[PDB]
Amino acid sequence: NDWHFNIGAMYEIENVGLAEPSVYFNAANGPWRIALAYYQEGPVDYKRGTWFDRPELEVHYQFLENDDFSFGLTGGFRNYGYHYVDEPGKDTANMQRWKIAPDWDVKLTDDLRFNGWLSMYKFANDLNTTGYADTRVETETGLQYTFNETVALRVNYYLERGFNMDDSRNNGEFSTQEIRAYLPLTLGNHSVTPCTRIGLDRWSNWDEGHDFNRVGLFYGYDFQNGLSVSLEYAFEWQDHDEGDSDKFHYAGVGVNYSFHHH
Ligand SMILES: *CC(=O)NCCNS(=O)(=O)c1cccc2c(N(C)C)cccc12
Ligand SMILES: CCCCCCCCOCCOCCOCCOCCO
Ligand SMILES: CCCCCCCCOCCOCCOCCOCCO
Ligand SMILES: CCCCCCCCOCCOCCOCCOCCO
Numbered sequence: 001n002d003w004h005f006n007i008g009a010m011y012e013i014e015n016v017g018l019a020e021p022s023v024y025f026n027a028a029n030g031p032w033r034i035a036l037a038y039y040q041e042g043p044v045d046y047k048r049g050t051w052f053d054r055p056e057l058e059v060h061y062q063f064l065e066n067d068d069f070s071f072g073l074t075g076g077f078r079n080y081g082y083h084y085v086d087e088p089g090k091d092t093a094n095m096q097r098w099k100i101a102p103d104w105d106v107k108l109t110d111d112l113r114f115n116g117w118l119s120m121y122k123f124a125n126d127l128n129t130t131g132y133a134d135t136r137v138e139t140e141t142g143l144q145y146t147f148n149e150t151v152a153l154r155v156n157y158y159l160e161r162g163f164n165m166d167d168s169r170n171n172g173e174f175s176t177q178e179i180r181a182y183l184p185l186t187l188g189n190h191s192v193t194p195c196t197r198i199g200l201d202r203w204s205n206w207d208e209g210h211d212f213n214r215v216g217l218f219y220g221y222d223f224q225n226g227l228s229v230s231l232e233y234a235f236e237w238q239d240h241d242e243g244d245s246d247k248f249h250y251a252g253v254g255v256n257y258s259f260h261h262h
Contacts, residue, residue, distance in 0.1 A: 001029050001030040001262060002029070002260055002261065002262040003027065003028070003029050003260065003261035003262055004027070004028040004029075004258075004260050004261075005025070005026070005027050005028075005258070005259050005260070005261070006024070006025065006026045006256055006257065006258050006259075007023075007024070007025045007256075007257050008023070008024050008025075008254060008255055008256035008257060009021070009022065009023045009024070009254065009255055010022045010023075010024075010230075010252060010253065010254040010255075011252070011253050011254075012250070012251070012252040013044065013250070013251050013252070014248065014249070014250050015044070015248070015249055016246075016247060016248055016249075017043060017044030017045065018041055018042065018043065018044065019041075019042065019043070019044045019046070020039065020040065020041045021039075021040055022037065022038060022039040022040070023037065023038050024036065024037040024038075025037075031061055031062040031063070031065075031072075032059070032060070032061060032062075033059070033060040033061075033062075034057075034058070034059050034060075035056075035057070035058040035059070035060070036056070036057055037054075037055070037056040037058075038053065038054070038055050038056070039053065039054040039055075039056070040052070040053045040054070041053075041054070048085060049085055049086070050082070050083065050084050050085055050086075050087070051082075051083055052080055052081055052082040052083060053079075053080075053081045054078055054079070054080055054081070055078065055079050055081075056076065056077065056078045056079075057076065057077050058074055058075070058076040058077075058099075059074070059075050059076070060072055060073070060074045061073050067107060068106070068107050069104075069105070069106050069107070070104065070105040070106075071102065071103065071104040071105070072102070072103050072104075073100070073101065073102050073103070074099065074100070074101040074102075074103070074117075075099065075100055075101075076097075076098070076099035076100075076101070077096065077097070077098055077099070078096065078097040078099075079094055079095070079096050079097075080093075080094070080095045080096075080097065080130070081093075081094055082094070082095070082126075082129075082130060089129070090129050093126040093129045093130055094125055094126055095123055095124065095125055095126050095127065095130045095132060096123070096124045096125055097121055097122070097123050097124075098121065098122045098124070099119055099120070099121050100119070100120050101117050101118060101119040101120070102117065102118055103115075103116065103117035104116060104117075108143075111145055111146050111147075112143060112144070112145055112146075113143065113144040113146075114141075114142070114143060114144075115141070115142070115144060116139060116140055116141025116142065116156070117139065117140060117141070118137065118138070118139040118141070119136075119137065119138040119139065120135075120136075120137055121135065121136040121137070121138070122134065122135060123135070123136070127169075127171065127172075128171070131171055131172050132162075132171070132172040133162035133163060133164050133169075133171060133172035133173045133174070134163075134164055134165050134166060134169070134172075135162070135163040135164065135165050136160065136161065136162050136163065137159070137160070137161050137163075138159070138160040138161075139157075139158070139159050139160075140156045140157070140158045140180065141156060141157055142154065142155050142156035142157055143155055143156075149186065150185060150186050150187065151183065151184070151185050151186075152183070152184050153181070153182070153183050154181070154182040154183075154184070155179065155180075155181050155182075156179070156180045156181075156182075157177070157178075157179060157180075158176075158177065158178040158179070158180050158197070159175075159176070159177050159178075160174075160175070160176045161174070161175045161176070162174045162175070170205060171205075172205070173204075173205055174202070174203065174204035174205065174208070175201070175202060175203050175204075176199075176201075176202045176204075177199070177200040177201045177202065178197050178198060178199055178200055178212075179197070179198045179200060180195065180196065180197045180198075181195065181196045181198075182194070182195045182196075183195075189221055189222045189223070189224065190219070190220070190221055191218070191219065191220030191221070191222070192217070192218065192219055192220075193217070193218040193220075194215075194216070194217055194218075195214075195215070195216045195217070195218070195234075196213075196214065196215055196216075197212075197213065197214040198211075198213055199211045199212035199213065208245070209244070210238065210244065211238070211239065212236065212237070212238055212245075213236065213237055214234055214235065214236040214237075215234070215235055216232060216233060216234035216235070216250070217232065217233050217234075218230065218231075218232045219231045219232070226257050226258045226259050227255070227256070227257055227258075228255070228256045228257075228258070229253075229254065229255050229256075230252070230253065230254035230255075230256070231252070231253055231254075232250070232251070232252040233250065233251055233252075234249075234250035234251075235247070235248070235249060235250070236248040236249075236250070
């Protein structure tokens with residue numbers, strides 16, 4: 001069929017600093033898509049501190065794609081390669097993550113749709129060092145009302161939960177529930193998505209713990225020649241000042257190149 005390829009890169013920054021460069025490549029033909037990525041995370045002022053890398057391979061299969069009903073499945077693999085500095089015990093660790101994730105999209109109306117994905121994760125190796133729960137489920141699922149070709153609203157429920165198959169561990173065991181709202185606007189070559197996340201409930205073993213809000217803004221531009229760029233800002237908080245975990249800032253820049261064959 002037609003071979004569709006993308007290459008791209010991104011740089012993300014977080015603080016209350018973390019610098020996070022990443023690269024990716026994906027390739028698609030008929031129902032099959034394969035994706036490779038490399039991500040790294042560590043202090044802005046690398047003094048210096050703990051960092052890690054995150055090579056990843058994902059494969060996607062589209063079972064069905066049409067107006068009334070679409071569904072597909074992702075399988076993935078990550079290694080998390082940790083390089084500890086200043087911390088009695090270890091110096092490096094490797095933890096793998098295995099992912100199986102169905103996705104779906106079903107029409108309820110000419111303007112209303114039900115869509116989502118669900119993910120099942122296993123984490124293997126060096127879990128004692130790294131603190132993770134060995135099992136995890138993640139889902140974002142909900143409704144999309146389309147106003148017109150320019151504007152759509154999406155309101156999703158989001159759950160992530162951590163479990164331990166090894167019933168003698170509570171390491172990395174948490175729960176998080178959110179409502180997440182988006183308003184993707186398409187304005188010629190410009191894309192703008194305002195988004196919100198409202199904590200419904202969260203508990204974890206590091207307490208985290210009550211009402212956690214995020215507001216953000218994605219800006220995208222397509223040059224109509226294969227190239228596109230992205231810029232995103234996000235602000236997260238608990239309730240500031242005393243509250244408990246107050247403020248967090250996120251900024252990200254990306255470039256994608258899209259080219260085809262056949
Ligand atoms: C406010 C907001 O983020 N809205 C959704 C963005 N949609 S997108 O264009 O697919 C996009 C762009 C850049 C990053 C994105 C992430 N990241 C976790 C970085 C996640 C989903 C979409 C997305
Ligand atoms: C096969 C042609 C691809 C050409 C793409 C060039 C630039 C984009 O890079 C995408 C590759 O993605 C990362 C690959 O996986 C990294 C493996 O890291 C292992 C380190 O231990
Ligand atoms: C602006 C987002 C609301 C889109 C609602 C789409 C419903 C179209 O079918 C008509 C159903 O009539 C019942 C009204 O339900 C409205 C839902 O609540 C409105 C937003 O709070
Ligand atoms: C752009 C349209 C967006 C409108 C939909 C927003 C819906 C947000 O709903 C959030 C519901 O929050 C419930 C709060 O949950 C905590 C309840 O208190 C329990 C503790 O006793």
